[PDB]
């Protein structure tokens, strides 16, 4: 997250931190995710496509820090890694960028809700907030493009949803952004998601309910003028999510 605010997991209790174990025992951070039911975390296919081996991955819930323990945190393995069959990537745009991770503890249990671990509501069909709506994003991704390490503390920021018409302008993304994608950015281009935030939530208060409207997917650079963050439009994928869970 470029700019924005340091946060803690109680403020973002659906947030899932996903890491990959390497041969030799080193563990690196991959991407964010969101808990949509006790056994299911939703993320982005692009985070796993090149290493699609579910045994490699560790998922934490209730975690506020990248490489230290948070009280109440819970550690999981991936029982099922489900990537979208029609995923593809162009030069900038990623398509069908959505993935589900069925999580289980070493004892075979799913998440136990607490003050720091909660599910986030899915949106209803064809129901997204109006452009101009302010929504939040959360993640452990880069704070500046010159960063070679991720921040140790979780971050969040607030961005505004941008219309499809605006996002398809020639100086934005033209026809590379589709109706299955949502653009969001800061009017001053000072805050944005960045590399490492992918897979994480774009949450909007929708009819008084905190809703998983988007999943961090792609964008040109980070907090670059006329280059919004692009998010998987979760509301388009409800049948896929329902069939695979």
């Amino acid at each position: 997250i470029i700019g924005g605010e340091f946060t803690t997991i109680e403020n973002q209790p659906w947030f899932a931190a996903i890491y990959r174990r390497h041969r030799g025992g080193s563990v690196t951070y991959v991407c964010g995710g969101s808990l949509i039911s006790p056994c299911w975390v939703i993320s982005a296919t692009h985070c796993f496509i090149d290493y699609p081996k579910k045994e490699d991955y560790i998922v934490y819930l209730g975690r506020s820090r990248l490489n230290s323990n948070t009280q109440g945190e819970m550690k999981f393995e991936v029982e099922n890694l489900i990537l979208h069959k029609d995923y593809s990537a162009d030069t900038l745009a990623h398509h069908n960028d959505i993935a589900l991770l069925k999580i289980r503890s070493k004892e075979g249990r799913c998440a136990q809700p607490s003050r720091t671990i909660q599910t986030i509501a899915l949106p209803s069909m064809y129901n997204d907030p109006q452009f101009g709506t302010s929504c939040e994003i959360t993640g452990f991704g880069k704070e500046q493009s010159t960063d070679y390490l991720y921040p140790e503390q979780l971050k969040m920021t607030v961005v505004k949803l941008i219309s499809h018409r605006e996002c398809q302008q020639p100086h934005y993304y033209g026809s590379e952004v589709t109706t299955k994608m949502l653009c969001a950015a800061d009017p001053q281009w000072k805050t944005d998601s960045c590399q490492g935030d992918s897979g994480g939530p774009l949450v909007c208060s929708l009819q008084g309910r905190m809703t998983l409207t988007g999943i961090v997917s792609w964008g040109r650079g980070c907090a670059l003028k006329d280059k919004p963050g692009v998010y998987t439009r979760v509301s388009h994928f409800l049948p896929w999510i329902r069939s695979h869970t």
């Binding site: 991959v30 692009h46 290493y51 040109r220």
Partner: peptide
């Protein structure tokens, strides 16, 4: 991998 932005996390060269 590559450090070319959102979309490119955890990628493999070749």
């Amino acid at each position: 991998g590559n450090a070319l932005g959102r979309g490119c996390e955890n990628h493999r060269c070749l």
